Design a protein around this motif. Structure first.
Motif, PDB file in Angstrom:
ATOM      1  N   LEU A   1     -47.398  -0.530  -8.352  1.00  0.00           N
ATOM      2  CA  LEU A   1     -48.423   0.409  -9.182  1.00  0.00           C
ATOM      3  C   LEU A   1     -49.158  -0.676 -10.063  1.00  0.00           C
ATOM      4  N   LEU A   2     -50.542  -0.506 -10.157  1.00  0.00           N
ATOM      5  CA  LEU A   2     -51.547  -0.897 -10.892  1.00  0.00           C
ATOM      6  C   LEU A   2     -51.583  -0.211 -12.249  1.00  0.00           C
ATOM      7  N   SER A   3     -51.686   1.124 -12.085  1.00  0.00           N
ATOM      8  CA  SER A   3     -51.714   2.067 -13.044  1.00  0.00           C
ATOM      9  C   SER A   3     -50.781   3.438 -12.771  1.00  0.00           C
ATOM     10  N   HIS A   4     -50.834   4.364 -13.474  1.00  0.00           N
ATOM     11  CA  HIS A   4     -50.169   5.439 -13.134  1.00  0.00           C
ATOM     12  C   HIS A   4     -51.035   6.372 -12.379  1.00  0.00           C
TER      13      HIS A   4
ATOM     14  N   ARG B   1     -51.188  -0.379  -5.611  1.00  0.00           N
ATOM     15  CA  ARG B   1     -51.598  -1.864  -5.334  1.00  0.00           C
ATOM     16  C   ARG B   1     -52.568  -1.718  -4.240  1.00  0.00           C
TER      17      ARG B   1
ATOM     18  N   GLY C   1     -40.835  -3.314 -11.784  1.00  0.00           N
ATOM     19  CA  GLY C   1     -40.076  -2.514 -10.897  1.00  0.00           C
ATOM     20  C   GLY C   1     -39.170  -1.539 -11.513  1.00  0.00           C
TER      21      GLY C   1
ATOM     22  N   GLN D   1     -52.748   6.295 -21.718  1.00  0.00           N
ATOM     23  CA  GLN D   1     -54.115   6.099 -21.285  1.00  0.00           C
ATOM     24  C   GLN D   1     -54.621   7.135 -20.157  1.00  0.00           C
TER      25      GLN D   1
ATOM     26  N   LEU E   1     -42.033   1.575  -9.519  1.00  0.00           N
ATOM     27  CA  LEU E   1     -43.034   0.971 -10.393  1.00  0.00           C
ATOM     28  C   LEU E   1     -43.982  -0.420 -10.183  1.00  0.00           C
TER      29      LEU E   1
ATOM     30  N   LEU F   1     -47.564   1.475 -18.051  1.00  0.00           N
ATOM     31  CA  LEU F   1     -46.763   1.020 -17.056  1.00  0.00           C
ATOM     32  C   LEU F   1     -45.518   0.113 -17.829  1.00  0.00           C
TER      33      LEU F   1
ATOM     34  N   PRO G   1     -48.611   7.378 -18.743  1.00  0.00           N
ATOM     35  CA  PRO G   1     -47.809   6.364 -19.587  1.00  0.00           C
ATOM     36  C   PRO G   1     -48.246   4.969 -19.068  1.00  0.00           C
TER      37      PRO G   1
ATOM     38  N   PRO H   1     -42.816   7.453  -8.044  1.00  0.00           N
ATOM     39  CA  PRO H   1     -43.060   5.885  -7.391  1.00  0.00           C
ATOM     40  C   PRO H   1     -42.378   4.790  -7.933  1.00  0.00           C
TER      41      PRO H   1
ATOM     42  N   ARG I   1     -54.616   0.775  -3.918  1.00  0.00           N
ATOM     43  CA  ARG I   1     -55.747   1.600  -4.476  1.00  0.00           C
ATOM     44  C   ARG I   1     -55.666   2.911  -3.970  1.00  0.00           C
TER      45      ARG I   1
ATOM     46  N   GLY J   1     -47.853  -4.087 -16.549  1.00  0.00           N
ATOM     47  CA  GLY J   1     -48.807  -3.176 -17.398  1.00  0.00           C
ATOM     48  C   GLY J   1     -49.786  -2.669 -16.760  1.00  0.00           C
ATOM     49  N   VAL J   2     -50.892  -2.033 -17.393  1.00  0.00           N
ATOM     50  CA  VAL J   2     -51.782  -1.255 -16.815  1.00  0.00           C
ATOM     51  C   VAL J   2     -52.769  -2.359 -16.292  1.00  0.00           C
ATOM     52  N   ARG J   3     -53.188  -2.530 -14.950  1.00  0.00           N
ATOM     53  CA  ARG J   3     -53.826  -3.779 -14.950  1.00  0.00           C
ATOM     54  C   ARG J   3     -54.978  -3.380 -13.699  1.00  0.00           C
TER      55      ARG J   3
ATOM     56  N   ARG K   1     -40.537  -9.747  -4.262  1.00  0.00           N
ATOM     57  CA  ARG K   1     -41.999  -9.587  -4.515  1.00  0.00           C
ATOM     58  C   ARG K   1     -42.448 -10.786  -5.481  1.00  0.00           C
TER      59      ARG K   1
END
Lengths: 734, 730
Positions: free
Chosen positions: A669-672, A676, A549, B586, A666, B662, B660, A664, A678, B545-547, A573
């Protein structure tokens, strides 16, 4: 600061008493006068400061005593003799210093200041140092063990052996597998520069500080011990003596910090039972030297949590004497109050709340004062009190002192300690400058820059001006009384930022929903962090910023459970309760303190609850406000069906045109590049106003924006934002 | 479909150890197996191409082709039990959480003697809850439907055949009654001699999660199923309501969470066995938030999660075996399979004997990482890639088109949950020589097994002999296996590790060795494993993390070994403490160039920069056209980087799509070190001394080795690695 203070409690019902503790550094008595706070934002461009004086309800003049603030955590073992025998003295500990550049920091000491008798073992960038008293007519002995200590586990000790006529001071690195483990020691001849202590040499034994009260330790202490004989000979050139090396006879004390992690007591395991008491709330339930990763919860594995983290700026419970008390008369209506203090032209306010009787309400509405969130942000030194802001505080007649200038009042859970670790505890038993009427948080270019208590008064002032009667309850009241306290009301209203909650306060609001009530979520970023609390340590809240977060600091691995109540801390969460399940929207974006406008989704006007948009022309609205110039701003909430939004949610409006600085949340997020759900992360930069029915008979109205209520008083309380809330409260009252 | 494919029971063997190969051939003719040494596995015309050394004189064989099936879908089998029921009737039920009811008929519990048309099955679907009863040799089965609209919540489901009341009952009730509209439905039919007591020959296996007349695989959580052969404002019958006598079986899924056995608590001891590795150590109905570890609170984890696409252990019979002779040198090998013009490869490794090295260097094959990615269906196998695969003569089958081979830990299951398990006892199309992963506009698009062959082919071409060990070997043997070698070299992506493999590498550093970290994003995720379930890896993507998916609250501990899963950061071991740099950025599969830090040439180890002109280099490669790309590692003193780290080069000019990592972020504007996030978009090549006698060399880039073969092995990246390995070899 000329005059300030605090109260033992923050809310009292009919017949309950609030004790006020004031510290006045004037030689003349001070005056206390009860007021009802109506508007606490001093911005000239808005309603201005507003009180209703009630000196005829409570007034008084009281003697000024100047009472101190002493930050720094430590333990005191009291009522014990002076340590040592004719054979000598041994003391030591396992330590992890986290800020040695801050000066002499005492591991353990015992010092009779008058008789100049005792000992003190200290660390600094010079190494490990022993100080021994030498009597009333000699300077102290000092023996230095020069070493470069880093932030690692070391064993430190001193030993006075009269039979060998030697003093030893040594330090050895606990992990011998590192490339160059530290092992240093210093040998001095004793030469009758020490003699066994005498009965009158007695004084308290301290861990973490020195009293002749200074040299507060920063870092972890683990398993300190004192012995007055030398260790039983058993069969590496030298090693550190620990408590296991001594007969039970020779042990003066051996503390095990693993016992009583949710308490302030440090336990001595020898038959002497020379226990001690922690002061200023050091941080417990942290990793100790045996922690290896297989255990992550101190409740089932206390030997991996056998250490205490001390900080030289820990502040809990100033211990001030009560200057006056107030008992709530059965006729004082439930509301937001303060004691205006006055002396020599200086003023303070001691805010508190008058709570209704359980089950017999005094209005159709109840407002929840977010005191857990206030306390978590309490005295946040934001490093923003520059000349331009200090000037604005003067011009506007705003509360004159800021945490940036006053470190004696301690820190918030948004700060780091002096060693760089996160502040996990916040006390309400200290002056809380950030909860004073008139206090400004931000140099806001497009409004007042007011938050929490002060910004919440925008809503209370609007409620009053529109003829809505309300009772007020706090988070502590919800903690004490449950959903049953809320059940009588036709609608419960939140503040602007109900961020911090326990399972009890979340359960109070859900149970109120289940009872058929209506819920007006009038802020943003609510129901995000968990707080810990205990009956055993009243007046403290615990915050552990675990996992992820948007966070000011990050908890270390294995230290995710609270010490105060043993619960898993962090994002709600992270304990399977998302904001969307309570109010249909959840924290999705955060930016600077700036606001923007909403756009009506006109498809809503025809759906259930779209009549709430009647008398808002549109298609935009809300591009104004005392909080950053817009009704959707700072921290925004949006809908997520995956995170729990009900399928019958009705989106009434959706913000737009936020500055590029908005990013956003954090934990969404699953990635940058992917949420979640998608979707892409830019779908998160938006505030959404929603309405839906609970299915129990009531409904939920959510704005998802901290600045929403900052727009209520615009254009003398006549504007689109004001009209919308009026529609909600009228609807919620049938 | 795939003409010939297969897998092996193990992926490495030392001298005298045996690898068993299991082949499925759809041809009517026998197939041939021939041993090869893999030299280069990248089929890109613009690079060295496919390259093998045939060793048919070491092993060749001709074997009969058998078509062996792949049956995805997890369930439990209780075997060796009689048919359930008595003259009083039959009752069965369970607590369930269906996670995908639109996928069709999904069986909670079943027992079906298919020949005698005798047994029962309780199924759910979007239509409700359905009982099917066998009806005899010349009749269709009875069906009783309890129409209900079920959601993803905990329900109690049951059926009861009461002969005394001449009633069948089928019912479903929502466990949480505090919800606004709790579901409570039931259907009552007259029995009318449409059932009676079973006969000895009606006996058959009892299944949980599937039906055998093998179909209707259940999606979701099952908890505490039971059977009773007697009866105890309706409520659901549960096992607690019955005599000890009346209970046929009552399974408690909380017993043996780290095993494949399901324990029956009645004195009948009618235990069962889980198939295709369903997911254990998941929240059950009693989970309330106070417990987060199944090892001390098993009653909160008394449920199992079944998926109709779980795949573990195909159970194929061994067509042939190979025992490693003392004369076969340690290297990367394969079994070339051939039939009817079709070709497959069964890769495996020959491990050196413990303590007896055959070369000065050893390479670590990242088999934990290969397996975590195995059969990753990326949804990217479009017309353009299929065409490219044709032109290049690359491995012709992709997981996207051939789903019988199951999923990767980067996929979601059909019900939307994350894939926590990856089996190696199945065909692993993504580990075949020739496999292309990406339609790469600037190179081959190659990963893992194939991309690591860039490095293996370069080592041979430059005259460096090397031994090979796998992650599994390090798990078995530890640092002692690495100690004899002058340098340990990683692959391009050593991402997945256990505490034992991380320890083997740390112990090797402490022994005085040299470590060449030749990849990026290494040492990032934890993997779980056990000798009780060989051939399976478990991955739980906890915290952040990146997941590819996010584990649920309270399910952070592995079922296989009970350890805290997720990022190694979250278990107090950052990549920087091992190799001086850690995953920081990434982007897409694209590469860029490095810039020399010319302050470096005078520092310790700046002689490695000799014969590199600079200031840029590496702007080429078979992986995305640049030696710094895809996933980058950079330095962080706060995250454990040694103070004597020497930065030799730093990448630059990455595309705007690079972002970056996460887990390095406190907010979208601040890293853990409180710098701005743009300081993360960089790969840094570092060198430093351990203090134990050796050194570490880290490139922090996945695509680095994609540039080694550029311009006939004569280039700056080749020059750089050659300099390192020469230095590491005295």
């Amino acid at each position: 600061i000329t005059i300030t203070g605090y109260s033992d409690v923050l809310s009292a019902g009919p017949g309950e008493t609030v004790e006020f503790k004031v510290s006045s550094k004037s030689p003349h008595p001070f005056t206390a006068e009860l007021v009802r706070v109506i508007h606490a934002d001093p911005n000239p461009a808005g309603p201005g400061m507003r009180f209703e004086p009630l000196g005829q309800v409570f007034s008084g003049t009281f003697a000024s005593f100047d009472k101190p603030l002493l930050p720094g955590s430590f333990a005191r073992v009291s009522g014990v003799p002076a340590a040592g025998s004719a054979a000598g003295l041994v003391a030591g500990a396992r330590i992890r210093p986290t800020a040695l550049a801050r000066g002499d920091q005492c591991v353990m000491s015992q010092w009779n200041t008058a008789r100049h008798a005792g000992f003190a073992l200290l660390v600094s960038e010079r190494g490990l140092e022993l100080r021994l008293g030498a009597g009333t007519g000699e300077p102290p002995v000092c023996v230095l063990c020069a070493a470069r200590l880093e932030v690692r586990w070391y064993d430190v000790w001193f030993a006075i052996d009269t039979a060998s006529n030697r003093i030893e001071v040594g330090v050895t690195e606990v992990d011998g597998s590192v490339a160059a483990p530290v092992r240093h020691r210093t040998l001095q001849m004793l030469d009758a520069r020490w003699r066994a202590p005498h009965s009158d040499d007695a004084a308290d034994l301290l861990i973490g500080a020195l009293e002749d009260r200074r040299a507060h330790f920063n870092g972890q202490i683990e398993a300190p011990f004192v012995a007055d004989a030398l260790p039983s000979p058993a069969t590496v050139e030298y090693a550190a003596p620990r408590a296991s090396d001594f007969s039970t006879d020779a042990l003066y004390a051996a503390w095990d910090f693993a016992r009583g992690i949710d308490t302030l007591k440090i336990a001595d395991t020898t038959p002497h039972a020379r226990h001690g008491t922690l002061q200023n709330l050091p941080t417990r339930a942290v990793r100790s030297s045996a922690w290896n990763g297989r255990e992550r919860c101190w409740r089932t594995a206390p030997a991996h949590y056998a250490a205490i983290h001390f900080h030289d700026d820990d502040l809990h419970d100033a211990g001030w004497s009560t200057d006056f008390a107030f008992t709530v008369p059965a006729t004082l209506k439930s509301g937001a109050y303060a004691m205006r203090l006055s002396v020599d032209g200086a003023t303070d306010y001691l805010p508190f709340y008058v709570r209704p009787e359980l089950g017999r309400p005094g209005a159709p509405l109840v407002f929840v004062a977010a005191t857990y969130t206030y306390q978590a942000y309490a005295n946040y030194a934001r490093g923003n009190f520059d000349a331009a802001l200090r000037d604005k505080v003067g011009r506007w007649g705003a509360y004159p002192h800021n945490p940036d200038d006053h470190p004696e009042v301690g820190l918030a859970t948004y700060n780091l300690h002096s060693d760089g670790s996160g502040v996990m505890f916040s006390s309400r038993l200290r002056p809380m400058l950030t909860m004073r009427p008139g206090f400004l948080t931000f140099d806001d270019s497009r409004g007042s820059g007011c938050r929490h208590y002060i910004a919440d008064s925008h809503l209370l002032d609007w409620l009053e001006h529109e003829g809505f009667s309300f009772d007020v309850v706090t988070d502590d009241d919800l903690e004490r009384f449950g959903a049953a306290l809320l059940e009588p009301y036709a609608a419960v209203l939140t503040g602007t930022h109900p961020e911090y909650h326990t399972a009890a306060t979340l359960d109070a609001l859900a149970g109120y929903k289940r009872s058929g009530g209506n819920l007006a979520y009038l802020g943003g970023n609510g129901f995000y962090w968990r707080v810990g609390r205990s009956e055993r340590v009243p007046g403290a809240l615990e915050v552990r910023r675990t996992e992820g977060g948007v966070r000011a600091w990050a908890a270390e691995a294995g230290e995710y459970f609270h010490a105060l109540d043993g619960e898993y801390g962090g994002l709600w969460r992270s304990s399977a309760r998302t904001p969307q399940q309570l109010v249909g929207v959840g924290f999705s974006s955060q930016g600077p303190f700036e606001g923007s406008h909403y756009r009506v989704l006109d498809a809503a006007r025809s759906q259930p609850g779209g009549s709430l948009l009647k008398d808002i022309a549109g298609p935009l609205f809300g591009g104004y406000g005392l909080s950053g110039g817009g009704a959707a701003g700072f921290e925004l909430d949006s809908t997520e069906a995956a995170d729990g939004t009900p399928a019958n949610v009705i989106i009434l409006a959706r913000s737009e045109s936020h500055s590029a600085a908005f990013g956003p949340a954090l934990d969404a997020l699953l990635s940058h590049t992917a949420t979640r759900a998608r979707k892409t992360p830019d779908t998160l930069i938006r505030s959404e106003i929603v309405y839906y029915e609970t299915g129990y008979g009531g409904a939920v109205f959510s704005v998802g924006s901290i600045t929403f209520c900052g727009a209520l008083s615009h254009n003398d309380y006549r504007n689109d934002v004001s009209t919308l809330l009026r529609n909600v409260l009228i609807r919620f009252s049938r």
